[PDB]
Amino acid sequence: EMEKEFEQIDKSGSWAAIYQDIRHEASDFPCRVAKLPKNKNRNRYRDVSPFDHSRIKLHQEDNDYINASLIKMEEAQRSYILTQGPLPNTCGHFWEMVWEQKSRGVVMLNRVMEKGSLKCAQYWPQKEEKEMIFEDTNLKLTLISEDIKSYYTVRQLELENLTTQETREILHFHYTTWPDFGVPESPASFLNFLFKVRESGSLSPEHGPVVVHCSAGIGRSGTFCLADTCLLLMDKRKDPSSVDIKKVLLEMRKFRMGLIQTADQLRFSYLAVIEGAKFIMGDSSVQDQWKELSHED
């Protein structure tokens, strides 16, 4: 039982050991491009780079580089794009990517400012009367509307390719109370938030991979994607307990490094998956319970 194993790990306080085993077994691929001197200012952190084999390439001719990774989950039938929280000089790239990948949604798991330090840049407009134009990638972005909740805000954005004048509605899901190296404020909050994204249709195969990011795009982003993939996994393979979260994470770390940055987020991943499992295997109310418990209102 998923529950039994979880309690065993907790009872023995093995979360740090398991998490540490994951780091040591994690894949390690080259990041030549990410480390090219010219791209130095395109990476928020020196030690966090997308693997070359899976990095998302901008279709631009100058520099196709952006600190983003395509996490393709074969069995789970779902791809995501994990990227760092855009930098002052990479906002055009970010949206360029969102455009070229035909993304429908963007999941932000961090705040533009955490403890006097900017964990990310204001890459989307805060006021509707002030659209944003990223001149380098010839993109226009406009806040159409937004639904502000207690711990998360969902925004409707219109992304326009100024070149072709083509337009697209991007759904911006912003979890606002997930601290760096911290965890969601309950499995309920998280799942409540994950299912909003799901019901939005942003994760649908009819759209490009959803863009998920935090600060470095590995900790919170990793946690969010791990949870979503495991729940996705234990629904298609009818035999949920066979889903080995630790291994799913390892599968994931093959496409981007450092997914899940703390033993606690790893534990949370298990909690969120176990909790969210109640949905996959019946119970059409736990979702109303998460919404209730998340106190989003």
Ligand SMILES: O=P(O)(O)C(F)(F)c1ccc2ccc(C(F)(F)P(=O)(O)O)cc2c1
């Ligand atoms: O999403 P989180 O909370 O996991 C994060 F973004 F806060 C986080 C994650 C990975 C990091 C790696 C390196 C640095 C660095 F400080 F070492 P560097 O020296 O490479 O800039 C900072 C990092 C911060």
